[PDB]
Design an enzyme around this catalytic site. Structure first.
Site, PDB file in Angstrom:
ATOM      1  N   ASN A 109       0.815  -1.211   0.000  1.00 26.91           N
ATOM      2  CA  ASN A 109       0.000   0.000   0.000  1.00 26.91           C
ATOM      3  C   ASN A 109       0.849   1.262   0.000  1.00 26.91           C
ATOM      4  O   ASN A 109       1.942   1.291   0.581  1.00 26.91           O
ATOM      5  CB  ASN A 109      -0.954   0.024   1.208  1.00 26.91           C
ATOM      6  CG  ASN A 109      -0.283   0.545   2.485  1.00 26.91           C
ATOM      7  OD1 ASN A 109      -0.232   1.764   2.736  1.00 26.91           O
ATOM      8  ND2 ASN A 109       0.245  -0.377   3.294  1.00 26.91           N
ATOM      9  N   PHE A 151      -1.256   8.559   4.211  1.00 27.17           N
ATOM     10  CA  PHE A 151      -1.982   9.244   5.274  1.00 27.17           C
ATOM     11  C   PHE A 151      -3.227   9.966   4.747  1.00 27.17           C
ATOM     12  O   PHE A 151      -3.354  11.172   4.909  1.00 27.17           O
ATOM     13  CB  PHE A 151      -1.082  10.267   5.984  1.00 27.17           C
ATOM     14  CG  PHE A 151      -0.066   9.661   6.902  1.00 27.17           C
ATOM     15  CD1 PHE A 151      -0.212   8.356   7.368  1.00 27.17           C
ATOM     16  CD2 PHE A 151       1.034  10.403   7.321  1.00 27.17           C
ATOM     17  CE1 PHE A 151       0.730   7.805   8.223  1.00 27.17           C
ATOM     18  CE2 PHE A 151       1.968   9.866   8.183  1.00 27.17           C
ATOM     19  CZ  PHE A 151       1.820   8.561   8.635  1.00 27.17           C
ATOM     20  N   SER A 192       6.098   5.290   8.680  1.00 29.41           N
ATOM     21  CA  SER A 192       5.362   5.121   7.444  1.00 29.41           C
ATOM     22  C   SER A 192       6.305   5.299   6.262  1.00 29.41           C
ATOM     23  O   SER A 192       7.073   6.251   6.204  1.00 29.41           O
ATOM     24  CB  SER A 192       4.216   6.099   7.324  1.00 29.41           C
ATOM     25  OG  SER A 192       3.667   5.991   6.020  1.00 29.41           O
ATOM     26  N   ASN A 213       5.358   5.903   3.246  1.00 35.85           N
ATOM     27  CA  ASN A 213       4.637   6.595   2.177  1.00 35.85           C
ATOM     28  C   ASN A 213       4.536   8.113   2.358  1.00 35.85           C
ATOM     29  O   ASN A 213       3.690   8.762   1.751  1.00 35.85           O
ATOM     30  CB  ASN A 213       3.234   6.000   2.038  1.00 35.85           C
ATOM     31  CG  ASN A 213       3.264   4.504   1.784  1.00 35.85           C
ATOM     32  OD1 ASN A 213       4.038   4.025   0.954  1.00 35.85           O
ATOM     33  ND2 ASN A 213       2.434   3.755   2.509  1.00 35.85           N
ATOM     34  N   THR A 214       5.403   8.671   3.191  1.00 38.51           N
ATOM     35  CA  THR A 214       5.479  10.119   3.384  1.00 38.51           C
ATOM     36  C   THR A 214       6.949  10.532   3.360  1.00 38.51           C
ATOM     37  O   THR A 214       7.738  10.089   4.208  1.00 38.51           O
ATOM     38  CB  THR A 214       4.820  10.562   4.718  1.00 38.51           C
ATOM     39  OG1 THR A 214       3.396  10.454   4.610  1.00 38.51           O
ATOM     40  CG2 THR A 214       5.187  11.992   5.059  1.00 38.51           C
ATOM     41  N   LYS A 238       6.114   3.862  16.936  1.00 36.64           N
ATOM     42  CA  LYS A 238       5.992   2.790  15.957  1.00 36.64           C
ATOM     43  C   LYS A 238       7.154   2.866  14.970  1.00 36.64           C
ATOM     44  O   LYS A 238       7.329   3.874  14.277  1.00 36.64           O
ATOM     45  CB  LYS A 238       4.653   2.870  15.213  1.00 36.64           C
ATOM     46  CG  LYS A 238       4.396   1.688  14.291  1.00 36.64           C
ATOM     47  CD  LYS A 238       2.972   1.681  13.752  1.00 36.64           C
ATOM     48  CE  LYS A 238       2.715   0.416  12.942  1.00 36.64           C
ATOM     49  NZ  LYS A 238       1.288   0.327  12.554  1.00 36.64           N
ATOM     50  N   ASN A 258       6.047  -1.479  11.483  1.00 38.44           N
ATOM     51  CA  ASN A 258       5.320  -1.006  10.327  1.00 38.44           C
ATOM     52  C   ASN A 258       5.586  -1.892   9.080  1.00 38.44           C
ATOM     53  O   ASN A 258       6.197  -2.964   9.174  1.00 38.44           O
ATOM     54  CB  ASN A 258       5.707   0.460  10.040  1.00 38.44           C
ATOM     55  CG  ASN A 258       4.535   1.283   9.507  1.00 38.44           C
ATOM     56  OD1 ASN A 258       3.785   0.823   8.638  1.00 38.44           O
ATOM     57  ND2 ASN A 258       4.349   2.493  10.052  1.00 38.44           N
TER      58      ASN A 258
HETATM   59  C1  LIG Z   1      -3.543  -0.754   3.877  1.00 35.63           C
HETATM   60  C2  LIG Z   1      -2.694  -0.481   5.082  1.00 35.63           C
HETATM   61  C3  LIG Z   1      -2.738   0.772   5.687  1.00 35.63           C
HETATM   62  C4  LIG Z   1      -1.958   1.021   6.814  1.00 35.63           C
HETATM   63  N1  LIG Z   1      -1.997   2.259   7.416  1.00 35.63           N
HETATM   64  C5  LIG Z   1      -1.243   2.514   8.546  1.00 35.63           C
HETATM   65  C6  LIG Z   1      -1.309   3.766   9.161  1.00 35.63           C
HETATM   66  O1  LIG Z   1      -2.035   4.649   8.708  1.00 35.63           O
HETATM   67  N2  LIG Z   1      -0.544   4.022  10.274  1.00 35.63           N
HETATM   68  C7  LIG Z   1       0.285   3.038  10.790  1.00 35.63           C
HETATM   69  O2  LIG Z   1       0.967   3.287  11.796  1.00 35.63           O
HETATM   70  N3  LIG Z   1       0.355   1.795  10.177  1.00 35.63           N
HETATM   71  C8  LIG Z   1      -0.412   1.527   9.062  1.00 35.63           C
HETATM   72  N4  LIG Z   1      -0.369   0.282   8.460  1.00 35.63           N
HETATM   73  C9  LIG Z   1       0.535  -0.771   8.999  1.00 35.63           C
HETATM   74  C10 LIG Z   1      -0.156  -1.780   9.884  1.00 35.63           C
HETATM   75  O3  LIG Z   1      -0.646  -1.089  11.009  1.00 35.63           O
HETATM   76  C11 LIG Z   1       0.887  -2.817  10.295  1.00 35.63           C
HETATM   77  O4  LIG Z   1       1.946  -2.106  10.903  1.00 35.63           O
HETATM   78  C12 LIG Z   1       1.461  -3.611   9.104  1.00 35.63           C
HETATM   79  O5  LIG Z   1       0.530  -3.740   8.050  1.00 35.63           O
HETATM   80  C13 LIG Z   1       1.967  -5.004   9.499  1.00 35.63           C
HETATM   81  O6  LIG Z   1       0.943  -5.805  10.050  1.00 35.63           O
HETATM   82  P1  LIG Z   1       0.124  -6.837   9.093  1.00 35.63           P
HETATM   83  O7  LIG Z   1       1.136  -7.705   8.363  1.00 35.63           O
HETATM   84  O8  LIG Z   1      -0.788  -7.669   9.953  1.00 35.63           O
HETATM   85  O9  LIG Z   1      -0.721  -6.083   8.095  1.00 35.63           O
HETATM   86  C14 LIG Z   1      -1.134   0.025   7.336  1.00 35.63           C
HETATM   87  C15 LIG Z   1      -1.094  -1.222   6.723  1.00 35.63           C
HETATM   88  C16 LIG Z   1      -1.873  -1.479   5.606  1.00 35.63           C
HETATM   89  C17 LIG Z   1      -1.808  -2.838   4.962  1.00 35.63           C
HETATM   90  O1  LIG Z   2      -0.926   5.997   5.114  1.00 34.74           O
HETATM   91  C1  LIG Z   2      -0.097   5.149   4.671  1.00 34.74           C
HETATM   92  O2  LIG Z   2      -0.068   4.937   3.444  1.00 34.74           O
HETATM   93  C2  LIG Z   2       0.535   4.241   5.526  1.00 34.74           C
HETATM   94  C3  LIG Z   2       0.972   4.645   6.786  1.00 34.74           C
HETATM   95  C4  LIG Z   2       1.694   3.772   7.602  1.00 34.74           C
HETATM   96  O3  LIG Z   2       2.040   4.114   8.732  1.00 34.74           O
HETATM   97  N1  LIG Z   2       2.048   2.500   7.142  1.00 34.74           N
HETATM   98  C5  LIG Z   2       1.655   2.111   5.847  1.00 34.74           C
HETATM   99  O4  LIG Z   2       1.946   0.992   5.424  1.00 34.74           O
HETATM  100  N2  LIG Z   2       0.960   3.006   5.028  1.00 34.74           N
END
Ligand SMILES: Cc1cc2nc3c(=O)[nH]c(=O)nc-3n(C[C@H](O)[C@H](O)[C@H](O)COP(=O)(O)O)c2cc1C
Ligand SMILES: O=C(O)c1cc(=O)[nH]c(=O)[nH]1
Ligand SMILES: CCOC(=O)c1sc(Nc2ccc(C)c(Cl)c2)nc1-c1ccccc1
EC number: 1.3.5.2
Length: 350
Positions: free
Chosen positions: A100, A104, A170, A172-173, A210, A239
Protein backbone atom coordinates in the site's frame (compact mmCIF):
# COMPACT_ATOMS: atom_id res chain seq x y z
CA UNK A 1 -14.45 -9.66 -1.66
CA UNK A 2 -11.20 -10.12 -3.58
CA UNK A 3 -13.20 -11.24 -6.58
CA UNK A 4 -15.47 -8.35 -7.45
CA UNK A 5 -13.90 -5.38 -5.74
CA UNK A 6 -10.52 -3.70 -6.00
CA UNK A 7 -8.73 -3.62 -2.58
CA UNK A 8 -9.53 -0.01 -1.65
CA UNK A 9 -13.23 -0.53 -2.45
CA UNK A 10 -13.17 -3.78 -0.48
CA UNK A 11 -11.70 -1.90 2.44
CA UNK A 12 -14.32 0.88 2.43
CA UNK A 13 -17.04 -1.77 2.35
CA UNK A 14 -15.39 -3.67 5.20
CA UNK A 15 -15.20 -0.50 7.31
CA UNK A 16 -18.83 0.29 6.51
CA UNK A 17 -20.18 -3.18 7.37
CA UNK A 18 -18.03 -3.33 10.50
CA UNK A 19 -19.24 0.09 11.64
CA UNK A 20 -22.89 -0.82 11.04
CA UNK A 21 -22.47 -3.90 13.24
CA UNK A 22 -23.70 -6.10 10.37
CA UNK A 23 -21.30 -8.89 11.29
CA UNK A 24 -22.32 -11.45 13.91
CA UNK A 25 -20.71 -11.08 17.33
CA UNK A 26 -17.80 -13.48 17.91
CA UNK A 27 -18.72 -16.73 19.67
CA UNK A 28 -15.28 -17.35 21.20
CA UNK A 29 -15.21 -15.99 24.74
CA UNK A 30 -11.82 -15.09 26.17
CA UNK A 31 -10.30 -17.26 28.89
CA UNK A 32 -8.37 -15.54 31.68
CA UNK A 33 -5.20 -16.98 30.11
CA UNK A 34 -5.41 -14.28 27.48
CA UNK A 35 -5.50 -11.37 29.91
CA UNK A 36 -2.59 -8.93 29.89
CA UNK A 37 -1.83 -5.96 32.14
CA UNK A 38 0.46 -3.40 30.56
CA UNK A 39 0.62 0.35 29.73
CA UNK A 40 -1.44 1.02 32.85
CA UNK A 41 -4.35 -1.03 31.57
CA UNK A 42 -5.91 -4.44 31.48
CA UNK A 43 -6.33 -6.08 28.06
CA UNK A 44 -8.85 -8.87 27.98
CA UNK A 45 -6.94 -10.56 25.15
CA UNK A 46 -3.63 -9.55 23.53
CA UNK A 47 -4.84 -9.42 19.93
CA UNK A 48 -5.57 -5.98 18.53
CA UNK A 49 -6.43 -4.50 15.15
CA UNK A 50 -3.45 -2.54 13.74
CA UNK A 51 -3.59 1.09 12.62
CA UNK A 52 -4.68 1.59 9.02
CA UNK A 53 -7.91 -0.35 8.98
CA UNK A 54 -10.00 2.21 10.85
CA UNK A 55 -8.01 5.29 9.91
CA UNK A 56 -10.75 7.70 11.00
CA UNK A 57 -12.34 6.03 14.04
CA UNK A 58 -15.59 5.04 12.30
CA UNK A 59 -15.73 1.37 13.25
CA UNK A 60 -14.27 1.14 16.74
CA UNK A 61 -17.24 -0.62 18.35
CA UNK A 62 -17.71 -3.04 15.46
CA UNK A 63 -14.06 -3.97 15.90
CA UNK A 64 -14.51 -4.92 19.59
CA UNK A 65 -17.60 -6.92 18.61
CA UNK A 66 -15.34 -8.66 16.14
CA UNK A 67 -13.37 -9.88 19.15
CA UNK A 68 -10.25 -7.72 19.28
CA UNK A 69 -8.90 -7.08 22.77
CA UNK A 70 -7.93 -3.55 21.83
CA UNK A 71 -8.39 -1.17 18.92
CA UNK A 72 -5.96 1.27 17.41
CA UNK A 73 -7.28 3.96 15.07
CA UNK A 74 -5.28 6.19 12.72
CA UNK A 75 -3.01 7.40 11.48
CA UNK A 76 -4.56 10.81 11.93
CA UNK A 77 -2.96 13.96 10.55
CA UNK A 78 -3.70 17.42 12.02
CA UNK A 79 -5.40 18.78 8.88
CA UNK A 80 -7.51 16.63 6.52
CA UNK A 81 -5.69 15.35 3.45
CA UNK A 82 -6.55 12.95 0.66
CA UNK A 83 -3.29 11.01 0.37
CA UNK A 84 -1.87 9.53 -2.83
CA UNK A 85 -3.76 9.07 -6.11
CA UNK A 86 -5.54 5.76 -6.74
CA UNK A 87 -4.75 2.93 -7.14
CA UNK A 88 -2.66 2.93 -3.98
CA UNK A 89 -3.24 -0.51 -2.51
CA UNK A 90 -2.53 -3.89 -4.07
CA UNK A 91 -3.17 -7.54 -3.27
CA UNK A 92 -0.45 -10.18 -3.69
CA UNK A 93 -2.58 -13.32 -3.11
CA UNK A 94 0.23 -15.79 -3.95
CA UNK A 95 2.24 -14.23 -1.10
CA UNK A 96 -0.62 -13.63 1.30
CA UNK A 97 0.68 -10.08 1.16
CA UNK A 98 -0.40 -6.52 0.50
CA UNK A 99 1.43 -3.44 -0.76
CA UNK A 100 0.00 0.00 0.00
CA UNK A 101 0.92 3.64 -0.58
CA UNK A 102 -2.07 5.53 0.88
CA UNK A 103 0.02 8.45 2.13
CA UNK A 104 -1.98 9.24 5.27
CA UNK A 105 -5.43 9.81 3.81
CA UNK A 106 -7.07 11.37 6.84
CA UNK A 107 -10.26 13.12 7.93
CA UNK A 108 -7.99 15.10 10.29
CA UNK A 109 -7.87 15.78 14.03
CA UNK A 110 -11.11 17.82 14.40
CA UNK A 111 -13.36 15.28 12.69
CA UNK A 112 -11.80 12.33 14.53
CA UNK A 113 -12.00 14.29 17.82
CA UNK A 114 -15.72 14.97 17.46
CA UNK A 115 -16.29 11.38 16.40
CA UNK A 116 -14.52 9.97 19.49
CA UNK A 117 -16.17 12.52 21.79
CA UNK A 118 -19.58 11.11 20.76
CA UNK A 119 -18.73 7.74 22.36
CA UNK A 120 -16.14 8.89 24.93
CA UNK A 121 -18.01 7.63 28.02
CA UNK A 122 -18.83 4.38 26.23
CA UNK A 123 -15.10 3.93 25.60
CA UNK A 124 -14.31 4.67 29.27
CA UNK A 125 -16.47 1.73 30.21
CA UNK A 126 -14.91 -0.51 27.55
CA UNK A 127 -11.44 0.41 28.82
CA UNK A 128 -12.37 -0.37 32.42
CA UNK A 129 -13.70 -3.61 31.03
CA UNK A 130 -10.34 -4.47 29.50
CA UNK A 131 -10.91 -3.16 25.98
CA UNK A 132 -8.50 -0.20 25.54
CA UNK A 133 -8.30 2.28 22.65
CA UNK A 134 -5.13 3.47 20.94
CA UNK A 135 -4.79 6.44 18.62
CA UNK A 136 -2.05 6.57 15.99
CA UNK A 137 -0.73 10.06 15.05
CA UNK A 138 0.64 11.11 11.70
CA UNK A 139 2.06 14.19 10.02
CA UNK A 140 0.61 16.22 7.14
CA UNK A 141 2.34 15.97 3.77
CA UNK A 142 3.06 19.71 3.45
CA UNK A 143 3.81 20.20 7.13
CA UNK A 144 6.87 22.31 7.90
CA UNK A 145 7.41 21.31 11.56
CA UNK A 146 6.97 17.56 12.10
CA UNK A 147 7.16 17.82 15.88
CA UNK A 148 4.42 20.45 15.96
CA UNK A 149 2.11 18.15 13.97
CA UNK A 150 2.61 15.43 16.55
CA UNK A 151 2.27 17.96 19.37
CA UNK A 152 -1.15 19.03 17.98
CA UNK A 153 -2.21 15.40 17.87
CA UNK A 154 -1.19 14.79 21.46
CA UNK A 155 -3.25 17.81 22.56
CA UNK A 156 -6.39 17.08 20.60
CA UNK A 157 -6.62 13.25 20.71
CA UNK A 158 -4.37 12.41 23.65
CA UNK A 159 -7.24 13.17 26.09
CA UNK A 160 -9.41 10.59 24.27
CA UNK A 161 -6.86 7.78 24.03
CA UNK A 162 -5.63 5.06 26.39
CA UNK A 163 -2.38 5.19 24.44
CA UNK A 164 -0.99 7.39 21.72
CA UNK A 165 1.31 6.20 18.90
CA UNK A 166 3.92 8.46 17.38
CA UNK A 167 4.10 7.03 13.89
CA UNK A 168 7.54 7.77 12.46
CA UNK A 169 7.84 4.67 10.26
CA UNK A 170 5.36 5.12 7.44
CA UNK A 171 7.13 4.47 4.14
CA UNK A 172 4.64 6.59 2.18
CA UNK A 173 5.48 10.12 3.38
CA UNK A 174 8.71 11.78 2.18
CA UNK A 175 11.23 12.23 5.00
CA UNK A 176 9.09 10.71 7.76
CA UNK A 177 11.29 7.69 8.47
CA UNK A 178 14.32 9.97 9.04
CA UNK A 179 12.50 11.05 12.23
CA UNK A 180 13.72 7.68 13.54
CA UNK A 181 17.25 9.16 13.61
CA UNK A 182 18.73 9.71 17.08
CA UNK A 183 18.93 13.54 17.28
CA UNK A 184 15.61 14.05 15.50
CA UNK A 185 13.86 11.32 17.47
CA UNK A 186 15.02 12.70 20.83
CA UNK A 187 13.89 16.21 19.97
CA UNK A 188 10.52 15.07 18.63
CA UNK A 189 9.75 12.77 21.57
CA UNK A 190 10.86 15.31 24.15
CA UNK A 191 8.25 17.68 22.78
CA UNK A 192 5.60 14.94 22.53
CA UNK A 193 6.17 13.81 26.12
CA UNK A 194 6.01 17.40 27.38
CA UNK A 195 2.63 17.88 25.75
CA UNK A 196 1.44 14.56 27.11
CA UNK A 197 2.60 15.48 30.63
CA UNK A 198 0.65 18.74 30.44
CA UNK A 199 -2.66 16.86 30.21
CA UNK A 200 -4.88 16.30 33.25
CA UNK A 201 -4.12 12.99 34.91
CA UNK A 202 -7.24 10.99 34.05
CA UNK A 203 -6.76 12.07 30.41
CA UNK A 204 -3.05 11.21 30.26
CA UNK A 205 -2.25 8.42 27.76
CA UNK A 206 0.78 6.16 27.50
CA UNK A 207 3.01 7.20 24.58
CA UNK A 208 4.48 4.62 22.17
CA UNK A 209 6.70 4.84 19.09
CA UNK A 210 5.99 2.79 15.96
CA UNK A 211 9.16 1.82 14.10
CA UNK A 212 10.05 0.36 10.74
CA UNK A 213 11.26 -3.19 10.06
CA UNK A 214 13.98 -1.78 7.79
CA UNK A 215 16.26 -0.21 10.41
CA UNK A 216 20.04 -0.65 10.55
CA UNK A 217 21.53 -2.09 13.71
CA UNK A 218 22.62 1.48 14.52
CA UNK A 219 19.08 2.90 14.18
CA UNK A 220 17.81 0.23 16.54
CA UNK A 221 20.49 0.86 19.19
CA UNK A 222 19.84 4.59 19.03
CA UNK A 223 16.09 4.14 19.34
CA UNK A 224 16.45 1.86 22.37
CA UNK A 225 18.81 4.42 23.88
CA UNK A 226 16.40 7.34 23.40
CA UNK A 227 13.41 5.31 24.52
CA UNK A 228 15.17 4.50 27.78
CA UNK A 229 16.55 7.99 28.22
CA UNK A 230 13.14 9.72 27.84
CA UNK A 231 11.01 7.03 29.47
CA UNK A 232 8.82 6.36 26.43
CA UNK A 233 6.12 3.91 27.50
CA UNK A 234 6.43 1.45 24.64
CA UNK A 235 7.22 0.42 21.11
CA UNK A 236 5.10 -0.79 18.24
CA UNK A 237 7.13 -3.17 16.12
CA UNK A 238 6.76 -3.04 13.16
CA UNK A 239 5.32 -1.01 10.33
CA UNK A 240 5.32 -2.18 6.69
CA UNK A 241 8.60 -2.87 4.87
CA UNK A 242 10.03 -1.06 1.83
CA UNK A 243 12.11 -4.18 1.16
CA UNK A 244 10.98 -6.87 -1.29
CA UNK A 245 12.13 -10.26 0.06
CA UNK A 246 13.40 -12.80 -2.47
CA UNK A 247 10.64 -15.17 -3.50
CA UNK A 248 7.64 -12.82 -3.88
CA UNK A 249 5.40 -14.31 -6.59
CA UNK A 250 2.63 -11.70 -6.93
CA UNK A 251 2.41 -9.82 -10.23
CA UNK A 252 2.22 -6.51 -8.34
CA UNK A 253 5.35 -7.11 -6.28
CA UNK A 254 7.16 -4.13 -7.84
CA UNK A 255 4.55 -1.54 -6.92
CA UNK A 256 5.93 1.27 -4.79
CA UNK A 257 4.80 1.21 -1.17
CA UNK A 258 4.92 -0.79 2.02
CA UNK A 259 4.72 -4.57 2.10
CA UNK A 260 2.60 -6.21 4.80
CA UNK A 261 1.46 -9.74 5.58
CA UNK A 262 3.27 -13.07 5.66
CA UNK A 263 6.47 -11.95 3.87
CA UNK A 264 6.94 -9.44 6.70
CA UNK A 265 6.30 -11.86 9.60
CA UNK A 266 9.79 -13.07 10.53
CA UNK A 267 11.49 -9.76 9.72
CA UNK A 268 9.08 -8.20 12.20
CA UNK A 269 9.58 -10.93 14.83
CA UNK A 270 13.34 -10.49 14.60
CA UNK A 271 12.90 -6.72 15.15
CA UNK A 272 10.80 -7.37 18.26
CA UNK A 273 13.50 -9.76 19.48
CA UNK A 274 16.25 -7.20 18.98
CA UNK A 275 14.29 -4.31 20.59
CA UNK A 276 13.27 -6.41 23.61
CA UNK A 277 16.94 -7.24 24.25
CA UNK A 278 18.22 -3.67 23.64
CA UNK A 279 15.64 -2.44 26.14
CA UNK A 280 16.33 -5.19 28.68
CA UNK A 281 12.73 -6.35 28.55
CA UNK A 282 11.65 -3.20 30.46
CA UNK A 283 9.80 -1.57 27.58
CA UNK A 284 6.40 -2.99 26.50
CA UNK A 285 6.25 -4.01 22.85
CA UNK A 286 3.22 -4.41 20.66
CA UNK A 287 4.19 -6.94 18.00
CA UNK A 288 2.78 -6.58 14.53
CA UNK A 289 3.52 -7.86 11.01
CA UNK A 290 2.19 -10.96 9.24
CA UNK A 291 0.24 -12.48 12.14
CA UNK A 292 -2.38 -14.97 10.77
CA UNK A 293 -2.37 -17.67 13.44
CA UNK A 294 -1.83 -18.52 17.10
CA UNK A 295 1.70 -19.69 16.36
CA UNK A 296 2.49 -16.38 14.64
CA UNK A 297 1.21 -14.54 17.70
CA UNK A 298 3.03 -16.74 20.21
CA UNK A 299 6.32 -16.44 18.37
CA UNK A 300 6.07 -12.64 18.68
CA UNK A 301 5.12 -12.88 22.37
CA UNK A 302 8.03 -15.24 23.11
CA UNK A 303 10.32 -12.89 21.17
CA UNK A 304 9.23 -10.10 23.51
CA UNK A 305 5.84 -8.66 22.55
CA UNK A 306 3.29 -8.16 25.35
CA UNK A 307 0.58 -7.56 22.79
CA UNK A 308 0.08 -8.24 19.09
CA UNK A 309 -1.86 -6.74 16.23
CA UNK A 310 -2.93 -7.93 12.80
CA UNK A 311 -4.27 -6.27 9.70
CA UNK A 312 -3.39 -7.99 6.40
CA UNK A 313 -4.53 -11.48 7.50
CA UNK A 314 -8.01 -9.97 7.78
CA UNK A 315 -7.76 -9.26 4.02
CA UNK A 316 -7.46 -12.92 3.03
CA UNK A 317 -9.28 -14.77 5.81
CA UNK A 318 -11.90 -12.26 6.98
CA UNK A 319 -13.26 -11.84 10.55
CA UNK A 320 -12.93 -15.52 11.61
CA UNK A 321 -9.15 -15.13 11.80
CA UNK A 322 -9.56 -13.23 15.07
CA UNK A 323 -11.13 -16.15 16.91
CA UNK A 324 -8.80 -18.58 15.19
CA UNK A 325 -5.71 -16.69 16.37
CA UNK A 326 -7.06 -16.44 19.95
CA UNK A 327 -8.08 -20.12 20.14
CA UNK A 328 -4.76 -21.35 18.76
CA UNK A 329 -2.87 -18.98 21.05
CA UNK A 330 -4.62 -20.47 24.08
CA UNK A 331 -4.08 -24.07 22.92
CA UNK A 332 -0.36 -23.41 22.29
CA UNK A 333 0.06 -21.73 25.68
CA UNK A 334 -1.31 -24.83 27.44
CA UNK A 335 0.80 -27.15 25.29
CA UNK A 336 4.05 -25.33 26.07
CA UNK A 337 3.50 -25.05 29.80
CA UNK A 338 2.55 -21.41 30.22
CA UNK A 339 -0.07 -20.39 32.76
CA UNK A 340 -0.95 -17.53 30.47
CA UNK A 341 0.11 -14.88 27.96
CA UNK A 342 2.05 -12.99 30.63
CA UNK A 343 4.37 -15.92 31.43
CA UNK A 344 5.28 -16.29 27.77
CA UNK A 345 6.32 -12.66 27.15
CA UNK A 346 10.04 -12.71 26.41
CA UNK A 347 10.37 -16.43 27.18
CA UNK A 348 12.73 -16.96 24.21
CA UNK A 349 15.25 -14.70 25.98
CA UNK A 350 15.27 -16.87 29.11
C1 LIG B 1 -3.54 -0.75 3.88
C2 LIG B 1 -2.69 -0.48 5.08
C3 LIG B 1 -2.74 0.77 5.69
C4 LIG B 1 -1.96 1.02 6.81
N1 LIG B 1 -2.00 2.26 7.42
C5 LIG B 1 -1.24 2.51 8.55
C6 LIG B 1 -1.31 3.77 9.16
O1 LIG B 1 -2.04 4.65 8.71
N2 LIG B 1 -0.54 4.02 10.27
C7 LIG B 1 0.29 3.04 10.79
O2 LIG B 1 0.97 3.29 11.80
N3 LIG B 1 0.36 1.80 10.18
C8 LIG B 1 -0.41 1.53 9.06
N4 LIG B 1 -0.37 0.28 8.46
C9 LIG B 1 0.54 -0.77 9.00
C10 LIG B 1 -0.16 -1.78 9.88
O3 LIG B 1 -0.65 -1.09 11.01
C11 LIG B 1 0.89 -2.82 10.30
O4 LIG B 1 1.95 -2.11 10.90
C12 LIG B 1 1.46 -3.61 9.10
O5 LIG B 1 0.53 -3.74 8.05
C13 LIG B 1 1.97 -5.00 9.50
O6 LIG B 1 0.94 -5.81 10.05
P1 LIG B 1 0.12 -6.84 9.09
O7 LIG B 1 1.14 -7.71 8.36
O8 LIG B 1 -0.79 -7.67 9.95
O9 LIG B 1 -0.72 -6.08 8.10
C14 LIG B 1 -1.13 0.03 7.34
C15 LIG B 1 -1.09 -1.22 6.72
C16 LIG B 1 -1.87 -1.48 5.61
C17 LIG B 1 -1.81 -2.84 4.96
O1 LIG C 1 -0.93 6.00 5.11
C1 LIG C 1 -0.10 5.15 4.67
O2 LIG C 1 -0.07 4.94 3.44
C2 LIG C 1 0.54 4.24 5.53
C3 LIG C 1 0.97 4.64 6.79
C4 LIG C 1 1.69 3.77 7.60
O3 LIG C 1 2.04 4.11 8.73
N1 LIG C 1 2.05 2.50 7.14
C5 LIG C 1 1.66 2.11 5.85
O4 LIG C 1 1.95 0.99 5.42
N2 LIG C 1 0.96 3.01 5.03
C1 LIG D 1 -11.40 -10.86 0.29
C2 LIG D 1 -11.86 -9.95 1.40
O1 LIG D 1 -11.90 -8.60 0.96
C3 LIG D 1 -10.79 -7.72 1.22
O2 LIG D 1 -9.96 -7.67 0.33
C4 LIG D 1 -10.74 -7.06 2.57
S1 LIG D 1 -11.75 -7.85 3.68
C5 LIG D 1 -11.37 -6.88 5.04
N1 LIG D 1 -11.90 -7.06 6.30
C6 LIG D 1 -13.19 -7.39 6.49
C7 LIG D 1 -14.01 -6.77 7.40
C8 LIG D 1 -15.33 -7.17 7.44
C9 LIG D 1 -15.85 -8.17 6.62
C10 LIG D 1 -17.29 -8.60 6.70
C11 LIG D 1 -15.03 -8.80 5.72
CL1 LIG D 1 -15.52 -10.14 4.60
C12 LIG D 1 -13.75 -8.40 5.72
N2 LIG D 1 -10.47 -5.93 4.64
C13 LIG D 1 -10.08 -5.94 3.31
C14 LIG D 1 -9.08 -4.99 2.78
C15 LIG D 1 -8.54 -4.00 3.60
C16 LIG D 1 -7.58 -3.12 3.16
C17 LIG D 1 -7.12 -3.23 1.87
C18 LIG D 1 -7.63 -4.24 1.07
C19 LIG D 1 -8.60 -5.11 1.50
Amino acid sequence: LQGLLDPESAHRLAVRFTSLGLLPRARFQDSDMLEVRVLGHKFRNPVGIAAGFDKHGEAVDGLYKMGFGFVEIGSVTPKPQEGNPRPRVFRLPEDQAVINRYGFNSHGLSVVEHRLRARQQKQAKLTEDGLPLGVNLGKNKTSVDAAEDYAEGVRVLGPLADYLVVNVSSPNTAGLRSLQGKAELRRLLTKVLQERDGLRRVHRPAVLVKIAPDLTSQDKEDIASVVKELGIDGLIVTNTTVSRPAGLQGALRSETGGLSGKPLRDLSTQTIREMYALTQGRVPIIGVGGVSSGQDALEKIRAGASLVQLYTALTFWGPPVVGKVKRELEALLKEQGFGGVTDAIGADHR
